[PDB]
Design a protein around this ligand. Structure first.
Ligand code: NAG
Ligand code: NAG
Ligand code: NAG
Ligand code: NAG
Ligand code: NAG
Ligand code: NAG
Ligand code: NAG
Ligand code: NAG
Ligand code: NAG
Ligand code: NAG
Ligand code: NAG
Ligand code: NAG
Lengths: 413, 419, 211, 198
């Protein structure tokens, strides 16, 4: 009644909202690694690089609690791209590369994808599809000195711009034009590096800032860095909610014969949906199959005649849901009959249903009609001795309601 | 430069006619699509993959999803109606007698074989061998099983063999098959004695024509190209809809669970809406093209239902409707998503040239043939039936007078016998 | 000297399992029927690296044992050095100085450690990551690089960030080797029932391959 | 129950217009589905973004309606071309086409107008009281084979008669209702009756 937006229901079969088996349990499988990542040897380090020669630290084979970073008051900026910091505690990565340097407070805005200028072009280039976080903080109380702290440098000149994560410590004199430089300064011939000379009296844009950029090796490759999370027992042949290394899903996990080559962690379907995985603790290949689903059709005589009702769970097997299995699906509330009749309401795969004798909804294999051996022989004919005039009505559509929509008044009112 | 065909100067004159002295019974296979796989796409589970978050953003778009399910449901219910209108033209399941006393014609290749788990004919078993789910996609079964389709083609065929056209216009009246074929000869303007007098020849021509169908269908993989094309179109359409789940549409990933496992809701909604927009547009493109394709399969099912009525339940006067040549008869064979008609047709095959004159002078009266052509071997004039050379003596029983000799452009002086 | 490369030097593009499917991918690959350069050690100059290298050797007593990569190769700037004997591998990017004839007697910002036969390798460099793929197979043809198909599997991936424009192989003394250059190409890859890349099409080789 | 063909045309077009009208109430991802509400809560720099979502969704909703009306108009036009062919062949004619104008042999048809359609009252002859007989394709008289000009040979059991095919009317067999062709020996199932001479 609600599906039809109606108080009457006519005789028929009506697809109401679909059936899904619900996940019985929620499961998690991360690697069984025990180290904790050395982030103190980055964010609490005594020294940070000159930006022309930024450091890189590989983080691997360890638990990473990113909430120790984003819960801390210590950081003045924490932009994240392709991720939110809150979600990093639930993810897993093959490696993470922590890139670090000192810059003046104005230059922090060049440390992003899509940027251009002396830092972005001559010192440190991010890829435009960088998935990662940029963490930065003021250090004028640590990295600044009376008469100036000159110990931090940047590259003011290069003959060509950096590609993503391209690094270059070359000291060569920058030749700006026709003047022959040959490793000494002059007009059109300039040394490529300059100091910030940080003094405590500097305005905020000229104060020293420390920067860490976290770059995630987020791939189909196996993980080695993972968020702080418990791992569960593994369940098979039963529909579960699941998580393997941060790949969330819902399905029937099974053992499988898929011959993964040793470097492969996942297998993908035509849609790019993962349809096999390797467990990261014990290296079995599990097939992933969708949790069972199908239409729910309601089979009814019209409300003008009865209010008893039958239901078809299309394609479903009755173990997954009177109850009666058919090729069309699990059929509920219908009386399975051994007789056969003409087809009232068509169920599918040769099955039909009707309301019959004290009455109930029956379901049966449909009758194609009476069977008839025509009395043929090489010398037998039948000739009809009398007739009937039939007047069989036929109805045909010829037109439909002429409509016009002023789409300007419809769209824009 | 392509050739349009061999060139032919038709040997015309105001007095030359060719009359054919012998024939061939052709059996020409016609294949027609009748239905296509009853797909049903759960547009919420296709677009949103059992995400609650996406499933609620999809409610911003109102009834776009329920009218897509309504459209694919109307396509699916039409495929059962298309199949019902072709095969369910027979009201009772007729069956053939135990003895095959059909006057030498041999239907054993087209009638059921009792030994099989579904009782198809031998040619239906060739036809069924030659023609070749998870992302909210499903396939619904047809209402009629292939065994019920084969009971309908068997009933149509047993009615056709034992009763002529009569099972379409009333209750089936039995008639001997060599007598039914003598009616099919009157239905093409060949005097019925031509069949009885050539009966053993005609039966062997039919049986050999049926043998060429077995050899063609066994050997030649391209024979069912129309049904295989319809199967390939629907497979290509679903493989396109499924690969379009892997498209980004400008989102960070095509994997909806990456977006939900990496972004907070305020940002995730913006990326998921690009996937909803692109997947909804992809599913609207699929359903629009399946409505356009269903209208073509319905046009072919309405043609197959019309060839069932006019070629199988009847004999057709419509040129090139029921195969090439003058139609005698047709037999339906079931095939995957379609029907095959074995159109039996009379083709004339051994012309002789003759002199012809439109009318004949006798006693100053112009005679015209009642049914036939005037023709001459060179000296003697015969009235002849118009589709098979049988010269008959020109006589007042096979001719009618109208007017005198003076009016007619081409009349010839002759004797006419009076019985 | 020169020879035909045939269909050699296909490698696994990503660490995803697939089966009974014809996946299409764009990557730096050795084009089919490309003009392979041939060297006889029994002959290791400095060569350009271009967009990456396919390298292979027919093998009987393991004479070819390492590689150099970089720009000036003369301690004025970094060079990626690779030295190998299958039981051990040593890799570094130091500002090395090299002699007149680099061979093996029978600022290091990064450092890393770990005929009868045809050995195949692919070397490429993208966004500061340097990558290696590999294959070994028994053979019977002594003469030249054999016609037939077998895909190379990944080994090593290094976050070095350093420019490369030239390279050079290293030889053991008290044997022949091949070089070809990769190009940006589109390939169609036949993953079989067991996830073996059994066959491929170079889509830009000829109009039939484009079909 | 018969009029469901025309009542479904009304119902499909009512369902299409009610879907198009109810789709005005949909947000399509805007702050509201009332266009005046957006324009009375926001300044133009903000409002143009929200209004463009309503324009995008109402435009797609109207394109979907018009496309499904084009496909439905092609379906009604096939039915109007069929009704125009039944008008010509069966009202203005008598059709020889099997089951084109009702089941049985077509005699005649009458058009009655109906809302958005036509109703044809197809008058057809149906044979109704079969009887079994013995039959034989030809008759052997003076060693001549005889065949019927029109209709069929049958016997009541002991006497041979010719009838038209579609109504039992036994006629005595004579050289007027039969034609000769050759000797008897060629014919599979000829029978040795007499034929009368008028
Ligand atoms: C990790 O998993 C392996 C099984 O593959 C098991 O033998 C080992 O004891 C586990 N180690 C820890 C620390 O859980
Ligand atoms: C429909 O129901 C009404 C009462 O609600 C009854 O009077 C009428 O006879 C019924 N008609 C049919 C066709 O059952
Ligand atoms: C239904 O499911 C059960 C397992 O729950 C299985 O044993 C049975 O064979 C299935 N039957 C059909 C017809 O799918
Ligand atoms: C159907 O008939 C069989 C006997 O042919 C019998 O065993 C079975 O119990 C019957 N089932 C029902 C539901 O009547
Ligand atoms: C009929 O006669 C003409 C005479 O020119 C000839 O060209 C033609 O081939 C003949 N056809 C047959 C069927 O004998
Ligand atoms: C028929 O045509 C020939 C020339 O082709 C001519 O001699 C003859 O007179 C014509 N006959 C008639 C009846 O026109
Ligand atoms: C390789 O290139 C040279 C020209 O530099 C050409 O003469 C030779 O035939 C080519 N060989 C092959 C295998 O294509
Ligand atoms: C391989 O080379 C290393 C040094 O790179 C050496 O220590 C080792 O002994 C060598 N092993 C073999 C089998 O030659
Ligand atoms: C290493 O780099 C520094 C500058 O960063 C340079 O002064 C030094 O000479 C280099 N080391 C060697 C061995 O040349
Ligand atoms: C797949 O691998 C198995 C051994 O793991 C082998 O028996 C089988 O023949 C292989 N299949 C093919 C098609 O090569
Ligand atoms: C004709 O005769 C046969 C004799 O077996 C009988 O079965 C059949 O019902 C009869 N049909 C009619 C219409 O009398
Ligand atoms: C008809 O068939 C029977 C066997 O069923 C046979 O004895 C009889 O001779 C046949 N009659 C004709 C006219 O073929």
């Amino acid at each position: 009644k609600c599906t039809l937006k109606s108080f009457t229901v006519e005789k028929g079969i009506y697809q109401t909202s679909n059936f899904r088996v619900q996940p019985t349990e929620s499961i998690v499988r991360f690697p069984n690694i025990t180290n904790l990542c050395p982030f103190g040897e980055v964010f609490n380090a005594t020294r940070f690089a000159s930006v022309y020669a930024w450091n890189r630290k590989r983080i691997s084979n360890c638990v990473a609690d990113y909430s120790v970073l984003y819960n801390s008051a210590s950081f003045s900026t924490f932009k994240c791209y392709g991720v939110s910091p809150t979600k990093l505690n639930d993810l897993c990565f093959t490696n993470v590369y922590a890139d670090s340097f000192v810059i003046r407070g104005d230059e922090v805005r060049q440390i992003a994808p899509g940027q251009t200028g002396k830092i972005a072009d001559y010192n440190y280039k991010l890829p435009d599809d960088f998935t990662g976080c940029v963490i930065a903080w003021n250090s004028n109380n640590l990295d600044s000195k009376v008469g100036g702290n000159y110990n931090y440098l940047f590259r003011l000149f290069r003959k060509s711009n950096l590609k993503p994560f391209e690094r270059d410590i070359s000291t060569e004199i920058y030749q700006a034009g026709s003047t022959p430089c040959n490793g000494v300064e002059g007009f059109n011939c300039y040394f490529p590096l300059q100091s910030y000379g940080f003094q405590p009296t500097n305005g905020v844009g000229y104060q020293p800032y420390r920067v860490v950029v976290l770059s995630f090796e987020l791939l189909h490759a196996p993980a080695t860095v993972c968020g702080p999370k418990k791992s569960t027992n593994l369940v098979k042949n039963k529909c579960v909610n699941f998580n393997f290394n941060g790949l969330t899903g819902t399905g029937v996990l099974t053992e499988s014969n898929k011959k993964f080559l040793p470097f492969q962690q996942f297998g993908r379907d035509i849609a790019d949906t993962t349809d096999a995985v390797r467990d990261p603790q014990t290296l079995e290949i599990l097939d992933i199959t969708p949790c069972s689903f199908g239409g729910v059709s309601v089979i009814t005589p019209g409300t003008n005649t009865s209010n008893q009702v039958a239901v078809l769970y299309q394609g479903v097997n009755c173990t997954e849901v009177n109850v009666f299995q058919t090729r069309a699906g699990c059929l509920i509330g219908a009386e399975h009959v051994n007789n056969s009749y003409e087809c009232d309401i068509p169920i599918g795969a040769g099955i039909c249903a009707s309301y019959q004798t004290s009455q109930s909804v029956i379901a049966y294999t449909m009758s194609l009609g009476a069977e008839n051996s025509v009395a043929y022989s090489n010398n037998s004919i039948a000739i009809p001795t009398n007739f009937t005039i039939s007047v069989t009505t036929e109805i045909l559509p010829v037109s439909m309601t002429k409509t016009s929509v002023d789409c300007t008044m419809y769209i824009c009112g | 430069t392509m050739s349009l065909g061999a060139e032919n100067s038709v040997a015309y004159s105001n007095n030359s006619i060719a009359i054919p002295t012998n024939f061939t019974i052709s059996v020409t296979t016609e294949i027609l699509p009748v239905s296509m796989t009853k797909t049903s796409v759960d547009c919420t589970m296709y677009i949103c993959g059992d995400s609650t978050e996406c499933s609620n953003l999809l409610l911003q778009y109102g009834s776009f999803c329920t009218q897509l399910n309504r459209a694919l449901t109307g396509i699916a219910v039409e495929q059962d109606k298309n199949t019902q209108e072709v095969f369910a033209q027979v009201k009772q399941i007729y069956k053939t007698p135990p003895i095959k006393d059909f006057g030498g014609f041999n239907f054993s290749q087209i009638l059921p074989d009792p030994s099989k788990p579904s009782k198809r004919s031998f040619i239906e078993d060739l036809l069924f061998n030659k023609v070749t789910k998870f992302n909210g996609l499903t396939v619904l079964p047809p209402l009629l099983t292939d065994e019920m389709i084969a009971q309908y083609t068997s009933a149509l065929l047993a009615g056709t063999i034992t009763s002529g056209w009569t099972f379409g216009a009333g209750a089936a009246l039995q008639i001997p098959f060599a007598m039914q074929m003598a009616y099919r000869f009157n239905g093409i303007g060949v005097t019925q004695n031509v069949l009885y007098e050539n009966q053993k020849l005609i039966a062997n021509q039919f049986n050999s024509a049926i043998g060429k169908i077995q050899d063609s269908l066994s050997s030649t993989a391209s024979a069912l190209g129309k049904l295989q094309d319809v199967v390939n179109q629907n497979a290509q359409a679903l493989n396109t809809l499924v690969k379009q789940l892997s498209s980004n549409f400008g989102a960070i990933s095509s994997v909806l669970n990456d977006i939900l496992s990496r972004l907070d809701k305020v940002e995730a909604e913006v990326q998921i809406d690009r996937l909803i927009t692109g997947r909804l547009q992809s599913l609207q493109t699929y359903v629009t093209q399946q409505l356009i394709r269903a209208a073509e399969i319905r046009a072919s099912a309405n043609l197959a239902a019309t060839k069932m009525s006019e070629c199988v339940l009847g004999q057709s006067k419509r040129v090139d409707f029921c195969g090439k040549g003058y139609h005698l008869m047709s037999f339906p064979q079931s095939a995957p998503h379609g029907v095959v008609f074995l159109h039996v047709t009379y083709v004339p095959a051994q012309e002789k040239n003759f002199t012809t004159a439109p009318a004949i002078c006798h006693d100053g009266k112009a005679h015209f043939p009642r049914e036939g052509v005037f023709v001459s071997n060179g000296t003697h004039w015969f009235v002849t039936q118009r589709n098979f050379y049988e010269p008959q003596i020109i006589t007042t029983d096979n001719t009618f007078v109208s007017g005198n000799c003076d009016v007619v452009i081409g009349i010839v002086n002759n004797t006419v016998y009076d019985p | 000297a020169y020879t035909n490369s045939f269909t050699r030097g296909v490698y696994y593009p990503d660490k995803v399992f697939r089966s009974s499917v014809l996946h299409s991918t764009q990557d730096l690959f050795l084009p089919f029927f490309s003009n392979v350069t041939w060297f006889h050690a029994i002959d290791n100059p400095v060569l350009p690296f271009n967009d990456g290298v396919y390298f292979a050797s027919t093998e009987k007593s393991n004479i070819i044992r390492g590689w150099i990569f970089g720009t000036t190769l003369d301690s004025k700037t970094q060079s990626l050095l690779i030295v190998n004997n299958a039981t051990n591998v040593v890799i570094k990017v130091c500002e090395f100085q090299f002699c007149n004839d680099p061979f093996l007697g029978v600022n290091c910002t990064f450092e890393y450690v770990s005929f009868k036969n045809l050995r195949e390798f692919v070397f490429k460099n993208i966004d500061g990551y340097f990558k290696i793929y590999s294959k070994h197979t028994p053979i019977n043809l002594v003469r030249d690089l054999p016609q037939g198909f077998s895909a190379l599997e990944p080994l090593v991936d290094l976050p070095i960030g350093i420019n490369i424009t030239r390279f050079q192989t290293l030889l053991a003394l008290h044997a022949a080797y091949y070089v070809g250059y990769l190009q940006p190409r589109t390939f169609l890859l036949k993953y079989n029932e067991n996830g073996t890349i059994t066959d491929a099409v170079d889509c830009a080789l000829d109009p039939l391959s484009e079909t």
